[PDB]
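Closing statement on the magnesium ion sub-project.
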Amino acid sequence: GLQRHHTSAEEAQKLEDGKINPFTGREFTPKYVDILKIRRELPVHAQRDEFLKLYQNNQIMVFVGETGSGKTTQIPQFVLFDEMPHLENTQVACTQPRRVAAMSVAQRVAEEMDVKLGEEVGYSIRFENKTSNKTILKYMTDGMLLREAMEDHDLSRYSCIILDEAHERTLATDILMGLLKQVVKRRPDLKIIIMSATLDAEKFQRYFNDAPLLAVPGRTYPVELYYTPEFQRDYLDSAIRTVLQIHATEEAGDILLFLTGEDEIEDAVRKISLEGDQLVREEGCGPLSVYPLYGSLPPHQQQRIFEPAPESHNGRPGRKVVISTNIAETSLTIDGIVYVVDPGFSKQKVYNPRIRVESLLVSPISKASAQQRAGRAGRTRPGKCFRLYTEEAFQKELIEQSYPEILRSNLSSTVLELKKLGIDDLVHFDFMDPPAPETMMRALEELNYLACLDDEGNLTPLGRLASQFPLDPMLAVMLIGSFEFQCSQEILTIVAMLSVPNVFIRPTKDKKRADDAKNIFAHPDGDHITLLNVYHAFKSDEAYEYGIHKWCRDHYLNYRSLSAADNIRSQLERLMNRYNLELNTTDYESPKYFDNIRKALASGFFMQVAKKRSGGYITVKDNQDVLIHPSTVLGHDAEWVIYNEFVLTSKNYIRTVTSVRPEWL
Amino acid sequence: WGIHFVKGEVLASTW
Ligand SMILES: Nc1ncnc2c1ncn2[C@@H]1O[C@H](COP(=O)(O)OP(=O)(O)O)[C@@H](O)[C@H]1O
Ligand SMILES: [Mg+2]
């Protein structure tokens, strides 16, 4: 009758059309029949038989296909039909890097199989676990699956694990690949499927021991390209004008607009809606609906982007505009897009090795990203892609390809997270794109020195507790230990201020004015108490009365950095309350307030101490000849100083310095 | 309106 891991495409197709739903035993709805008719035309259904032949004689396979081929919403169904999980109490997990994609695809698959969402097919996001004991298919964020692996190393509850959007090369995806390549050895019945959108995936095959590859033939129409003849100063106004022009003159077909973030998206939505209403009023053009799309949208708002374009009423075509943000690129596909507007800027994560801070900064996209954005333009008819930059910029300004997130993030937090999963041979761990051995060794050494990893290399309670926080383990350990010195709140503030980009702007011109503005806050003991003073003066009601933006601009302060610092401080306070960690403070008027703060601060930065040379300073670690930075507030000789940042120029410098008495070290 | 464009290259069909 039905054989596990031995079915065929014909048997599955025949069982699909049966009047009885195999997974639940209820009656099929006509909606399911119509959806099946619509979705049977996708490219993957043609190769279904080849995929079945491949999935039975191998454990790991690579399935590469152009976006829109129907991989995330179809392949899991093929696996379900070939596996019959409900007869063995096992599930199938598909990992989506993006939360919005996971939720939307889960809802779509629930609709397709004619089963209520949350019963058979569900999703699992952080703080949102929409699933039950009857779930057979689960769409989960890669972070959530990593957490589950942390709880259950062997993943004994899953029979098949599908890694979607493997070309994004996020950190969680890389760790998951590295872990599964080894987990497969223990479990003979586990079956992996790596799915990618790049039609060239030779290196994936090489990494997975020459795993078989299956390619979906390209089905994208030609798309013309357009550029501007000069550089664009303001790209948001240019994007608005381009969208309005496209709606006014071009033919019928929806528009896709890529922007940076939530606030920009909302402002663009409002502006475009107002301009469209004015255009309809004055020129009598067709209606133009607007839908936003970003990470935090609720599902009832996410589902709106798929609604059909409004019917025309002015004798000209109606249109639908989706103001997306690097989610329409490859995560999900919208049917009906013919025109694409590509400002060229996207929000990317960057890491600063010297300060050890991760920030989300708007930077230009790579050539691959621009090519994918253009390709999104044509899938139904020959489309057009309008780029808001010069062709010379595209051919010279952009970078060939972006780097994997493993090389663009702290390598110590990554090690501390890997140790949670139970890995032992970190140096011999097989990463997709290994970092240089020097940095890995340095990270391991630093972690051992902080007591996060004991001499045996195993995790310790302090290590786990520090891992819970979103900070560099040094600052996390200092935060945990600060409660003993009766100055916990001050250290919390200082850590929050130190975990963000520099809050001072020091241009070449007006430098003396900036120095005076800093000295307004400066305390003649170190540059660390200065950050505390700046934060205290930032939230003072006097500043709010004066005007927060004006006050920040006048005093040469970075408002964005201080807002980020306040957000991080609130998050840290919440997290500290969560784990029941002692918090306290010393009265301001007490003479030992600064003594307490410096005592707690020296116990955390003991790894970075410099001594005043006889004669400017010599570091205790690595014995580097350095000079206090000119932008400093040190008052006295400061025989022993604590430095946070290292500045490399013709003459070495140390920045953010503060004094400390020898007895405290 | 207010933006003018210059035609560029064409991406051939992948069929
Ligand atoms: N929520 C939805 N509503 C309507 N159609 C959808 C929805 N989600 C996906 N689709 C359709 O199903 C297809 C999904 O393909 P997909 O699984 O994204 O393949 P890939 O991930 O490889 O691009 C798209 O062509 C899209 O038109
Ligand atoms: Mg997909």
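The pocket of magnesium ion (ligand 2) is lined by residues A 71-72, 164 (CB under 6 Å). With this model delivered, the sub-project is considered complete and its resources will be redirected to Aim 3.
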